[PDB]
Structures are given as structure tokens and as C-alpha cells.
Amino acid sequence: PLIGEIGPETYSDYMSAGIPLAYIFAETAEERKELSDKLKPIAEAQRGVINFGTIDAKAFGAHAGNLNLKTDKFPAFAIQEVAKNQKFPFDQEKEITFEAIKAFVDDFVAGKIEPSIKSEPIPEKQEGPVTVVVAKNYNEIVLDDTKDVLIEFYAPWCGHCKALAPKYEELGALYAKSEFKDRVVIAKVDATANDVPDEIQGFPTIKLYPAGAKGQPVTYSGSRTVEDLIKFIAENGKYKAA
Amino acid sequence: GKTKEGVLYVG
């Protein structure tokens, strides 16, 4: 059929087809059938341009994360550009109608949709001395030209990251009670759960984005002690802060 | 393939 079933057996063939895959996520076979029937004419119009399939959002709801979709909100629709490793999620707050999916797919084909940037949600509160960065607040926080921003790119599974974390919190606390508390940010970002503009080759990576020098961040290479990190901030930031 | 969490993968 034109709209097949995306699952562990058919995934490799969709990934080998060399064209995007549009996913129709729904939690029941009836809804999958309803949406497949509804959207068939769009799949037909796109034959050989974009493959369409349904995907069992009960069994494979987690797969929605691969498309920068929320893993808990169905039904859902997204296009994966397999060539380019780009993901184009349709807004899970909108109803999946013929007209809206047609307009979405038409916009995708027209080049009108920017690839989605993977991000955790904006943290609901920013209290505790270390600031949590996600892709959606990276520009506002890290590239804030009025603050020296120390940013740790880490993975939750990373042993050195785990070892660093208590020292990193001690560092945040020192700055938070310093006379530089409104111009130094001690921040971290889970680089496994957020796309960042930085090229990160290993974890942890620590960079200082100085006030007034955001295009020239300084990569830290010291001993990862609190004292060494204070020195690093003091030496490389605009505010010579400690 | 699928992971235990239900993520699909190739190969």
C-alpha cells in the first residue's frame, strides 16, 4: 500500500529509500486507519517524493522523540529528512486535518519550514545557583552580552561529568554570593538532550562566553577544580570576576 | 530493529 506501516521490520527500507519519511503516529489501529485514509491523497500527490506511513504510537511512542515530537501527545505527524538528518514536527497542539497536513507537507516541499532544533523544555524555574540551559534558551542566556557565561556541555551518563557536578555547584554558589552575581552566569546544558551550536567533541566541555566577546568563547583546559575555574573566569571574562 | 523503549533503528 501507499501508506505502509513503520515498525522495526520496515524502518530500514524507509531509511534506505533516500527520500523523506512522513510519520502518522496514533495510539490505536482504528485511528491509524482513519488518518491513513484521510491523508492518502497527500501521500499519492507525494508518491516517490515523500514516503508516508503510520506508526503505532503505543508501542513506538518513544520514537516520536527522534522527530522532536513530544512522546506523550498523540496523534502526531512529522517528516524526517533522512538524507539531511533533519526533523520537521507538525505542531502537536494542532488538529491533524486534511487541510492542515496538506499545507504542512506543501510548506515542507516548498522549503518554508526550518529544521527543528532539539530542545528540552524551558525549565519552569531557574533557582539553585547553576543555570540550566536548553536549546530554546541558549541564545538568551549564553549569548547575553552583559554577562560572562561559563557553560558546561555535559552528558548525564558521563563519569567525569558526574565527578565535576558537585564542584560545579560549589562554583555557582560562590559566584551567586559574589559582587559579580549579576554579571556572571554559571550554566550547564545536557548536550545529549539539546542541539547546541557548539561543536562538542567530548564531555564535559567547559567554555566561557565572555560579555562583549560572544564570538570568541574560550575553551577551558584546566584541572577542573573550583579554584582553577574561578581563575579561568577571572582571567578570561570581561568582568575579571571572582 | 527496536529498542526496549520502542525507538526504531536500522540494522
TrEMBL record, chain B:
Residue runs in coiled coils: none
Annotated signal sequence range: none
UniProt similarity note: Belongs to the synuclein family.
The protein's name in its UniProt record: Synuclein alpha
